[PDB]
Design a protein around this ligand. Structure first.
Ligand SMILES: Nc1ncnc2c1ncn2[C@@H]1O[C@H](COP(=O)(O)OP(=O)(O)OP(=O)(O)O)[C@@H](O)[C@H]1O
Ligand SMILES: Nc1ncnc2c1ncn2[C@@H]1O[C@H](COP(=O)(O)OP(=O)(O)OP(=O)(O)O)[C@@H](O)[C@H]1O
Ligand SMILES: [N-]=[N+]=Nc1ccccc1COC(=O)NCCCC[C@H](N)C(=O)O
Ligand SMILES: [N-]=[N+]=Nc1ccccc1COC(=O)NCCCC[C@H](N)C(=O)O
Ligand SMILES: [K+]
Ligand SMILES: [K+]
Ligand SMILES: [K+]
Ligand SMILES: [K+]
Ligand SMILES: [Mg+2]
Ligand SMILES: [Mg+2]
Ligand SMILES: [Mg+2]
Ligand SMILES: [Mg+2]
Ligand SMILES: [Mg+2]
Ligand SMILES: [Mg+2]
Lengths: 264, 264
């Protein structure tokens, strides 16, 4: 008895990476569904009894402790930002990916512009070097893909003044991903906003783009010192850590809790 | 020499509750500004050297530990939600306060609808009672006021099944605000969405509205058991804790860091 696409889709929702079950072994859909429902209810009950922290929240807290302890100031800046920031970032009419709000606002697609403003302002009060970071929601319209979400969570850390070299940027990235237990390589790439990037890759999955300044865009943001920075997607980190097949398992969602289907 | 409105406004930006300085003593603006700039640079330098955690982030983490330890599951749900949720909540054409995104979406003005969906789904898998909470950004268009932000941070905790009484709701609120060191009273009020509320007041400042179910809206959300819940604004909690005159000192902002002006 062969499984329909709808039946396979339902079993895939209930399947977890740790399972090893053949979906098309010939066992009937009813028994495969019942087995997976039982495994997932047990998993959720164990979370509720013993491990009540959300994966995205817990990872944000772990990353926050890492950067605070290394001397970076924790920033929480607006998610709803002026639309004028988009063109000023060199996103010329990525631009199609912006969620607009009212007539003059949008949802931020990255943390960089708010962090650029903080670097400039804090440089008037704090000693060299200025080290800051932020973790929070960012928004992009995307085609359906196993590695993209329209609502995702970014970490960006950055530094301005002394110590803003490629070697120090790579060392921070290495210490960070070693702390999380994630292997990686660095490959060159390029993007419209920042130019050349050092992309942090786990296999074919891009975990981060990082940048060594200065870049021409600096003048438009009042940045006038060396700087380094890197942006990472937290859901991509979670996808690696938990071997999820689709990044949706990691997202803000009413459909998955810590990678377990909530449709039980 | 009298201070202009622009001069007083600048000094108020730089003034902090712990200061006691007369702005209109007759001392010249230049000296008052220089004194306040020096106090604020010292305050920011001390934060950077010793206390690098953001007040909103730190408070979210403190609240998260409180509720996780008391048996509530930590939720992180979408901020960008379907516009259809608004009318289904009984917000008839508050409705004017909704930030719309594209044609079918909006920024959530509260956490309740996403938490209602989680209560319903989790009740099929978890033992009675179901206890969950969320902390995160919410959005409302507001008139300019000392107690309102357009981008704010909500905590909502809620419970469904046994133990969903007024006395237990008040006891959780009392334990929570005792943990934060904030005195309060409970006053009855009423709102369009939920009906009668127990409003948690610190003086004339509304910290929370709380609700004892069931209510007629339950049927439209598939909720069919007793429930209790309460929503609190984190920036209002911070305003009380730090004696801020305006809630903007507590907000996500590029203009204040932990209540200290970033325009230094
Ligand atoms: N839509 C998305 N969903 C999930 N994570 C994302 C998304 N877009 C970017 N990220 C994460 O944010 C990081 C920094 O953003 P960046 O602008 O470099 O992404 P990107 O180069 O557009 O990524 P990609 O090429 O995969 O679309 C990325 O390396 C990735 O980890
Ligand atoms: N615009 C806002 N800015 C900051 N906090 C808010 C805002 N709106 C609501 N809150 C906080 O969220 C809690 C729950 O939201 P609720 O819908 O009860 O607010 P509300 O009754 O509209 O508040 P208010 O009467 O002060 O406008 C409030 O008690 C308050 O602490
Ligand atoms: N627009 N903008 N931001 C500007 C623009 C001009 C100058 C300086 C900043 C801000 O530089 C920072 O401190 N943040 C990190 C920058 C690189 C982020 C990483 N490549 C990412 O894509 O996640
Ligand atoms: N819409 N909606 N939510 C509905 C709608 C119907 C039924 C059940 C919920 C969700 O009930 C919850 O579990 N959350 C807390 C509810 C009260 C929140 C508090 N008064 C506040 O205003 O912050
Ligand atoms: K497997
Ligand atoms: K999404
Ligand atoms: K004072
Ligand atoms: K605001
Ligand atoms: Mg992209
Ligand atoms: Mg890329
Ligand atoms: Mg990239
Ligand atoms: Mg209101
Ligand atoms: Mg009210
Ligand atoms: Mg209220």
């Amino acid at each position: 008895p062969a499984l329909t696409k709808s039946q396979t889709d339902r079993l895939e929702v209930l399947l977890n990476p740790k399972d090893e079950i053949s979906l098309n072994s010939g066992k009937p859909f009813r028994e495969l569904e019942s087995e997976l429902l039982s495994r997932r209810k047990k998993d959720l009950q164990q979370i509720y009894a013993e491990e009540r922290e959300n994966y995205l929240g817990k990872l944000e807290r772990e990353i926050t402790r890492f950067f605070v302890d290394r001397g970076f100031l924790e920033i929480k800046s607006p998610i709803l930002i002026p639309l004028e920031y988009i063109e000023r970032m060199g996103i010329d009419n990525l631009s199609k990916q912006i969620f607009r709000v009212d007539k003059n606002f949008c949802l931020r697609p990255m943390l960089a512009p708010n962090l650029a403003n903080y670097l400039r302002k804090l440089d008037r009060a704090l000693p060299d070097p200025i080290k800051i970071f932020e973790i929070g929601p960012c928004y992009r319209k995307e085609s359906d893909g196993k590695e993209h979400l329209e609502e995702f969570t970014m970490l960006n850390f950055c530094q301005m003044g002394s110590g803003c070299t490629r070697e120090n940027l790579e060392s921070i990235i290495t210490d960070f991903l070693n702390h999380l237990g994630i292997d990686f390589k660095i490959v060159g790439d390029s993007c419209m906003v920042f130019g050349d990037t050092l992309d942090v890759m786990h296999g074919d999955l891009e975990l981060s783009s990082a940048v060594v300044g200065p870049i021409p865009l600096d003048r438009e943001w009042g940045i006038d010192k060396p700087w380094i920075g890197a942006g990472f997607g937290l859901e991509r980190l979670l996808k690696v850590k938990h071997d999820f097949k689709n990044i949706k398992r990691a997202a803000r969602s009413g459909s998955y809790y810590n990678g377990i289907s909530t449709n039980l």
